[model samples]
Target: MSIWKEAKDASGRIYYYNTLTKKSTWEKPKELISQEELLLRENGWKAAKTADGKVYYYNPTTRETSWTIPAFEKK
Candidate 1:
């Protein structure tokens, strides 16, 4: 499984966190001209999906992390 977490600065810059690697990647607002990239930047800490299509988030305030699956999808 893959996981990702992210947060945004006031100017809509984004920072992505790699859970397994414990690493972060930054994308400045000016570097994010694409539609998808801008969308993600605007919605930080909202259970984002990674490039590999994994969905999860870490709640710093609650000190909790959660994983999500599509409820309507077949098992």
Candidate 2:
């Protein structure tokens, strides 16, 4: 089974942790995946499916797992 953990820091940068090694790696802060990128492009079904097809977007600035649905783009 897989033994990795993924998390977002305060800036929304992604992190990778190896459970076996007890080590963590950090990603430079960047924009969270776009709704389209996460959905149509990357097919992030979990995020999209949970948001009810509302085209949600997330940023690491909140550090709260809070998300928003962009108002202008819908494809």
Candidate 3:
């Protein structure tokens, strides 16, 4: 079985947790990211974190990073 599971947080935000480590990360797991990249590029996705501690995802179709994954599909 996959060690990674996509789930929701207490606040209902999208989230993922590793059963192995039992840790939380805002960064999505790499295995899941492959398909996510496909979905993002289909709309057209990577990265930059703001000084204020906000992270951004890049859009190849446009240029540079966006506040979030550009047209990031909710899967």
Model 1, 1-75: lDDT tens digits are 244567776798778666677866664333333433434334332355678897765445555565742232222
Superposed on all Cα atoms, the candidates' RMSDs to the truth, in angstroms, are 14.3, 12.6, 6.0
State the TM-score for model 3: 0.37
- Once fitted onto the true fold, the runs of candidate 3 whose alpha carbons sit more than 4 angstroms away are 35-75
Best by TM-score: 3
Candidate 1 Cα errors over 4 Å, as ranges = 10-12, 27-74
Global fold similarity of model 1 (TM-score): 0.27
How big is the positional error of residue 20 in model 3, measured in Å on the Cα after superposition? 1.2
lDDT of 2 by residue, 23-61 (tens): 776642223344335453342222333535654345444
Candidate rank order under TM-score: 3, 2, 1
Worst 10 residues of 2 by lDDT: 40-49
lDDT-sorted candidate list, best first: 3, 1, 2
Q: lDDT tens digits, residues 1-75, model 3?
A: 356777888899887788887877767767766765666656655555778888777766667666765443355
Of 2 and 3, the candidate ranking higher by TM-score = 3
CA shift at 13, candidate 1, in angstroms?
2.1
Report the lDDT of model 3 for residue 36: 53
